[PDB]
Amino acid sequence: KRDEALFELIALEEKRQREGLELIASENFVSKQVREAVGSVLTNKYAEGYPGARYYGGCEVIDRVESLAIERAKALFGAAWANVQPHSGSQANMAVYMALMEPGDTLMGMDLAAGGHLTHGSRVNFSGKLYKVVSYGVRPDTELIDLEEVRRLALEHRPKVIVAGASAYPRFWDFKAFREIADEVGAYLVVDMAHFAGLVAAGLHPNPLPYAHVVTSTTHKTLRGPRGGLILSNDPELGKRIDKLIFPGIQGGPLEHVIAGKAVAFFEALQPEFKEYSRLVVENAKRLAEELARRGYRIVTGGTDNHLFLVDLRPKGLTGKEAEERLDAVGITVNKNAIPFDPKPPRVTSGIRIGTPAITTRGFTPEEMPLVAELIDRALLEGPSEALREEVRRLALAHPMP
Amino acid sequence: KRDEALFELIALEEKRQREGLELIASENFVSKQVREAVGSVLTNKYAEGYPGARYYGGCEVIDRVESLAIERAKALFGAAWANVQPHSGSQANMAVYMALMEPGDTLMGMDLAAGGHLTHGSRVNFSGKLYKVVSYGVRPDTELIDLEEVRRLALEHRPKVIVAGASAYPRFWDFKAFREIADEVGAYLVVDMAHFAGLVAAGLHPNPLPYAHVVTSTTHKTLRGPRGGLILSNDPELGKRIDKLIFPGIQGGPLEHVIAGKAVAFFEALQPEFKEYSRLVVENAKRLAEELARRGYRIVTGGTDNHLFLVDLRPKGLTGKEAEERLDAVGITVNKNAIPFDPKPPRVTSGIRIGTPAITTRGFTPEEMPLVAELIDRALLEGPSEALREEVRRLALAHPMP
Ligand SMILES: *Cc1c(COP(=O)(O)O)cnc(C)c1O
Ligand SMILES: *Cc1c(COP(=O)(O)O)cnc(C)c1O
């Protein structure tokens, strides 16, 4: 018997995805073939260990699949070693931290409020629970990272690991500078490129591989792959240690169906078409930010170098919470985000974060950003209305999903 | 462009699965609908947080999907609370340990050599790295757990957490007694039912819910669901604490497509047909163990109460590794496994573990176990040969696949 109650919900979710504008920066829409791989029979195989060194018989084909994912990841990112088994970006970071540190050691990462991720040191996360944490943010006068301050903090706190990368930072990273700082204090530099991995793959964002000791990432987000994690490095010896932390360290059986999906995603990203997609993602973000600025909003840092940007809602007297609600009411999904030194508490905020990967995948182009900006502005100024919700629905439907 | 190379590999794995006898105790074959859910568009939604308490909007449908999985898990196992977000059985255990203990606390579990899982205290696993581990085993004469011995170990070491359940123990567990022991030292009793969860759901194995403080499990294995984890408890308040450890504690975004698959698997397990399936799983295991015993193989504990059993190959002059390889050579897949008081190192072992969940799903019946036993025996005695390989292939192909 078919589980009709569950499948009725999946149909509803498909409809929801088709009829709204997804502007959450960490979202995207995977291809039908990525889904085909993830929904494959590869889930039936227990394959603890690594290719050619498994703890179960019958892994001959799974080994070819995982090796393919590994080799493609190395070719795509110009890496010498890769681990494609992390179940998520969080597990990728967890394995790396445990391979480079012991509980009690000091971890340095970007403050959550400044754009850092929970796994970069939050007290409610394993990162802050297992390690002592020192955080860096952005300057009040520039809204950008202050390398001089990062260096000062590193020298004073002597972290064992320094993490570069974030979930809500709209500009490029100076990986060379971070590595120089790490070397000065004898710390490992870990770059978490989860958000901008697709841009790195497309050659549209500085490549952290040569500068970081280890690079972690999600396979979803700008890379547009299945939900999961990834680890890369130019140091195979260090890679061997990290492999041991993924298994038997923190995971058991890998999700080989998802690994097959990662291989497919890497195949897609290796095609010239992915660079064109990525160029449009960045152009769309830059243009949408400009169009919103022209309509009366302020953009944190004045713009963006990547796929996302932060809108300062203060010029129009709105809070991030209010903006998120009004937009949600008309079918546009964004998320509130604190602006630098936000005068409002975290549960309220004075801004919202917008990212273009998802709508770009659905066919939105730069010349359509003025319209998107207008719809966003109308929702925030007039508030929700049936007419606006339906205009958004029609626009979304006119841009079919993969 | 289609990733032909990757899909050709998936086709080869489908072929491998169709033409061999998969006897790995922890494997199974998921249904087409479980695969359909896992390969759904639900992977495109970031749902950090919990139903009705998400970080981002747009989870209206996702919440109903996760909630359906939660309520079905509760109904299936008679639990007051459930967390369906763990990415794997390992993450389920990791979250529970971190919710109940602080690094350095004493963790008591079953010795790996006696049947315990690596997450029950292995020195190279997070369990043994973060906590001080003490382990209980089985009696050398009966190869069964001695509750009095377990009680003495608990009183001596005063563990904060005692884990009952294992990945390679062929007999029933006295959960009531384990709870009494935990209570004697004020420890939390955690039951890891990953291997026998399906049997518990079918009412063919003692249910740990009333006695354990917390129950962890995989959704794959005897439960025959998608690859992932699960946590249950008879105490909703303790559940609230554990929810915080899964997120924001050790994970980020949950795999909602997999959670949809969990809902489907729970639906399937709630059907009367699942009880019949589970009955056949146990009957097949008992009969296959008997058939091998009649061929001179020594079965640990002399038989089994569940879906798996261990074969001590020392008398046959074969190591577990050699046996695993010989069988794999003719399409019969198993995994080497240590035997109680095994003299050989883990990398070699003196035995193999066999389980019937997978072949039972394909339609194998107790009356066919005499033939399976013959093929296993011949593979170990005569070694690989195209002739034997073909006989295995024929028997396998005589059974359809989910
Ligand atoms: C998204 C993200 C993660 C975590 O990934 P999950 O798959 O949600 O566990 C970690 N670090 C950064 C910088 C991220 O953007
Ligand atoms: C299978 C198993 C696990 C781990 O599950 P993974 O999904 O492989 O991480 C943990 N404990 C027990 C008893 C298991 O059988």
Q: A56 at the B interface (CB within 8 A)?
A: yes
Cβ-based neighbour number of residue A53 at 10 Å: 10
> Which DSSP string do the residues of B13-62 spell out, in sequence order?
HHHHHHHSEE--TT-----HHHHHHHTSGGGG----EETTEESSS--HHH
How close, in Å, is residue B148 to chain A by CA atoms? 31
**Chain A touched by B400 (CB under 8 Å):** no
Q: What is the CA radius of gyration of chain A?
A: 21
Residue B271 contacts A, CB cutoff 8 Å: yes
Upstream peptide bond of B248 is cis (omega within 30 degrees of 0): yes
What one-character DSSP code corresponds to residue A51?
T
By C-alpha distance, which of B283, B400, B378 is closest to B332?
B378
Phi-psi category of residue A48: left, alpha or beta, with phi > 0 → left and psi -120 to 50 → alpha: beta
The pairing of strands A161-164 and A188-192 is parallel
Rounded to the nearest whole angstrom, what is the distance from the C-alpha of residue B56 to the centroid of ligand 1?
A: 15
At A375, give phi and psi (nearest 5°).
Answer: -65, -40
E runs forming strands in A8-64: 21-22, 49-50, 53-54
Rounded CA separation A252/B117 (Å): 10
Closest by CA position to A114, among listed A145, A149, A141 = A145
Reduced 3-state DSSP string for B150-167:
HHHHHHHHCCCEEEECCC
CA distance A391 to B95: 45
CB-based contact A233:A215 (threshold 8 Å): yes
Report which residue type is found at A229: G
Rounded to an integer, what distance in angstroms lies between the CA atom of residue B284 and that of residue B293?
A: 14
Note the residue count of chain B.
402
Query: Between chains, do B13 and A62 touch, taking CB under 8 Å as contact?
Result: yes
Contact status of B162 with chain A (Cβ, < 8 Å):
no
Active site residue A192: yes
DSSP at B297: P
CA distance A359 to A352: 17
Residue with tokens 């509750």: B147
Q: Given ligand 1 and candidates A91, A163, A192, A353, which is best to mutate, with the most ligand atoms within 8 Å of its CB?
A: A192
Between the CA of A252 and the centroid of ligand 2 the distance, in Å, is 6
Q: Where are the beta strands (DSSP E) in B51-209?
A: 53-54, 81-83, 106-110, 132-136, 161-164, 188-192
Documented resolution in Å: 1.1
Q: Give A-chain residues touching B130 at CB under 8 angstroms.
A: 103
Structural domains in chain A, CATH included, are 1-27+280-402 (3.90.1150.10), 28-279 (3.40.640.10)
Atom of ligand 2 nearest to the CA of B93: 10
Contacts of B232 (CB under 8 A, 6+ apart): B73, B74, B77, B79, B81, B82, B83, B209, B214, B215, B216, B217
C-beta of residue A68 within 8 angstroms of C-beta of residue B5: yes
First to last CA, chain B: 29
Name the nearest CA neighbour of A201 among A226, A221, A183, A186: A221
Of B13, B73, B16, the C-alpha closest to B396 is B16
Q: How many CB pairs under 8 A join A and B?
A: 246
**DSSP output for A356-369:** -HHHHHTT--GGGH
Rounded-to-integer distance, Cα A5 and Cα B260, Å: 11
Q: What is the CA radius of gyration of chain B?
A: 21
> In DSSP terms, which residues pair with A135 in a beta bridge?
A109
Element at A336 (helix H, strand E): strand A335-336
Question: Would you say the C-alpha torsion A378, A380, A385, A386 has a positive or negative sign?
Answer: positive
B221 labelled catalytic = yes
Give the whole-angstrom CA distance, residue B169 versus residue B146: 13
What is the residue with the minimal CA distance to atom 15 of ligand 2? B167
B302 backbone φψ class: left, alpha, beta (φ>0; ψ -120 to 50): left
Cβ contact, residue pair A252, B118, below 8 Å: yes
β-pair partners for B22: B333
- Which ligand gives the minimal distance to the CA of A164? 1
Distance between CA atoms of residues B98 and B126, nearest Å? 11
- B41 in contact with A, Cβ within 8 Å: yes
- Whether ligand 1 lies within 6 angstroms of the CB of B252 is answered as yes
Residues listed for chain A = 402
